[PDB]
């Protein structure tokens, strides 16, 4: 036996020595040394110092620059707001609880910190899916006589909120649950216990298919069609040097967006697929915290790829940061 069960938790450490305590009451210094909790707190501090100003500046430059308030940029602001939910709804809480050694807010705070951390991560995920759909509709033009206006961009933002609520709310009403994970300092979806009272198996499968396989197919198709349209348009217009330059730049960005999406969610998909399959094994709390390293850091490198690498946002950010004149 490799774990210790409880009414609302699961500590990945056998209680054969009698040292295991509830992650809501006592520190968990038997599954990880205190310095490992300080390093957990140190990395959370890194994500806050780098994630907040980069995502807040994105919302700030949009207020000061009229040319940034276009409908195609609505989903990029939704990405920045989603990353802010990951910072204050999860990163700040994990920094606080890690310094105590356990989740000090109890089961109620576990559902709150779990709902907001899952919501912010899923809004950002579906924002990258809607962004790929919008860019596929605008560039490839598969719809005869279609203009992407403001009403379509609002539906694209509302679609991300519905898909995220259809993913973070079921654990609050009986489909799966939120429990502390890894070092028992942050709460998330349960995929390490086969908890039959909440049907954790049907939820992990529904999550793997609807909220990972479907987004992965849509992104590959939309961006695949976009690279095909751009490459064939440049092939019929090789006398234009800027069209040949745009074809290479667009192709390079699609590779970056696709690879960054895989680095973000594939480690979370593979490890959680192994933890749920080969269940009950001696899963180390360090082993638990390596899909979270890639997914939580997306609050930093998604604005770098989708905002700072955008020519309009980068110019407005340099202007705002350089006192208004550059």
């Amino acid at each position: 036996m490799n774990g210790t069960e409880g009414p609302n938790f699961y500590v990945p450490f056998s209680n054969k020595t009698g040292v295991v305590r509830s992650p809501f009451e006592a520190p968990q210094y038997y599954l990880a040394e205190p310095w490992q909790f300080s390093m957990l707190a140190a990395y959370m501090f890194l994500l806050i110092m780098l994630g907040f100003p980069i995502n807040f500046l994105t919302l700030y430059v949009t207020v000061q620059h009229k040319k940034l308030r276009t409908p195609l940029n609505y989903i990029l602001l939704n990405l920045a707001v989603a990353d802010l939910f990951m910072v204050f709804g999860g990163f700040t809480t994990t920094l606080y609880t890690s310094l105590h050694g356990y989740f000090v807010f109890g089961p109620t705070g576990c559902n709150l910190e779990g709902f907001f951390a899952t919501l912010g991560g899923e809004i950002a995920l579906w924002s990258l899916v809607v962004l790929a759909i919008e860019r596929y509709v605008v560039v490839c033009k598969p719809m005869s006589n279609f203009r992407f206006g403001e009403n379509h961009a609002i539906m694209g933002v509302a679609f991300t909120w519905v898909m995220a609520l259809a993913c973070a709310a079921p654990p609050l009403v009986g489909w799966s649950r939120y429990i502390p994970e890894g070092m028992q300092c942050s709460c998330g979806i349960d995929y390490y216990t086969p908890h039959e009272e909440t049907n954790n198996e049907s939820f992990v499968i529904y999550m793997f298919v609807v909220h990972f396989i479907i987004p992965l197919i849509v992104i590959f198709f939309c961006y695949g069609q976009l690279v095909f349209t751009v490459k064939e348009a440049a092939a019929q217009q090789q006398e234009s040097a800027t069209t040949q330059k745009a074809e290479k730049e667009v192709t390079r960005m699609v590779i970056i967006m696709v690879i960054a999406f895989l680095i973000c969610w594939l480690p979370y998909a593979g490890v959680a697929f192994y933890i749920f399959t080969h269940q009950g094994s001696d899963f180390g709390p360090i082993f638990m915290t390596i899909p979270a390293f890639f997914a939580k850091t997306s609050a930093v490198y998604n604005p770098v790829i989708y905002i700072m690498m955008n020519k309009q946002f980068r110019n407005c950010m340099v202007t705002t940061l350089c006192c208004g004149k550059n």
Partner: peptide, 11 residues
């Protein structure tokens, strides 16, 4: 498509 690529922020 150069104008659509600028609207979507890809070029």
């Amino acid at each position: 498509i150069l104008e659509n690529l600028k609207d979507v922020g890809l070029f």
